[PDB]
Design a protein around this ligand. Structure first.
Ligand SMILES: CCCCCCCCCCCCCCCC(=O)O
Length: 221
C-alpha cells in the first residue's frame, strides 16, 4: 500500500526515506521519526512486499529481498537486491518530480532495509544528502569496484549505527561494513556509532544521534 509518512508541517524542502527491517512495516519507524521530526522534512517509510523467505522455508513475510542465510558467506539474492534498489530509485525520483531535489533527500534503513539503502545510495546516479544505516550490512560486498565508487555520491555522508549485543546482525558486520564504506566513499564523512547493551533494535540515544545527523545535513530554507 501507500508508504507510511510523517508529513512536513510546512512545505517539504527535504525528505527522509527510511526502509524497515525484515518482517516489519513502515508504521513503527514512521512513528519513531515523528518523535524527531523537523517541520520542513517529509519522512517516508515504504512497506516491503510480502514474499517467501528461503531461510524460513518460504513462509511469506514482508521482505525487501530474499534471505538465504545469515553467514557472511551465504549466497545473496543478487537479482532481488538489485530490483528492490531500483524500486527505491523510483521512489526517490518521484519525490523529485514532486518538488524535493534528491540532494535534499536522506536515504536510510534498519537491518535488511539498511542494507538496501546502503546498496541503493552507492549505486545510484541521483545525488543524495546522506545515509543513515542502522544495524545493517553492505549487500553484495564483492560486486563493488576495488577503489572509490566515484560518480554522484562519492562524498556522501553516512551515519551508521549498531548495537554491540546484536545476535542477529553481529556488531562486527556493521564495523566491517564501515571499513568497506571508507574505501568506497570519502571516509571523512563516514561515522560509525555503537550503543552498548543494545541488541537488534533501536534506542532513544540512537534516535537522537540520528536526528542530529539529519538536522545538520538537511537544515531549513
Ligand atoms: C560486510 C560483511 C558482513 C556482512 C556480510 C553478509 C551478511 C548477510 C546476513 C545478514 C542477514 C540479516 C537478516 C535481516 C534481519 C532484519 O532485517 O531485521
Amino acid at each position: 500500500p501507500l508508504p507510511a509518512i510523517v508529513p512536513a508541517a510546512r512545505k517539504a524542502t527535504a525528505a527522509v526515506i527510511f526502509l524497515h527491517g525484515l518482517g516489519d512495516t513502515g508504521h513503527g519507524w514512521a512513528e519513531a521519526f515523528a518523535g524527531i521530526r523537523s517541520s520542513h522534512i517529509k519522512y517516508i517509510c515504504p512497506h516491503a512486499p510480502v514474499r517467501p523467505v528461503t531461510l524460513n522455508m518460504n513462509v511469506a513475510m514482508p521482505s525487501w529481498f530474499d534471505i538465504i542465510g545469515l553467514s557472511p558467506d551465504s549466497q545473496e539474492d543478487e537479482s532481488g537486491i538489485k530490483q528492490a534498489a531500483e524500486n527505491i530509485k523510483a521512489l526517490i525520483d518521484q519525490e523529485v518530480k514532486n518538488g524535493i531535489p534528491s540532494n535534499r533527500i536522506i536515504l536510510g534503513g534498519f537491518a535488511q532495509g539498511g542494507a538496501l539503502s546502503l546498496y541503493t545510495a552507492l549505486t545510484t546516479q541521483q545525488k543524495l544528502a546522506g545515509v543513515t544505516a542502522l544495524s545493517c550490512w553492505l549487500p553484495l560486498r564483492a560486486s563493488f569496484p576495488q577503489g572509490p565508487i566515484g560518480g554522484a555520491n562519492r562524498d556522501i555522508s553516512i551515519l551508521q549505527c549498531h548495537g554491540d549485543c546484536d545476535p542477529l546482525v553481529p556488531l562486527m558486520f556493521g564495523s566491517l561494513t564501515v571499513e568497506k564504506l571508507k574505501t568506497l566513499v570519502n571516509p571523512a564523512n563516514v561515522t560509525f556509532k555503537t550503543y552498548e547493551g543494545m541488541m537488534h533494535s533501536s534506542c532513544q540515544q540512537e534516535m537522537m544521534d540520528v536526528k542530529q545527523f539529519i538536522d545538520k545535513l538537511l537544515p531549513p530554507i
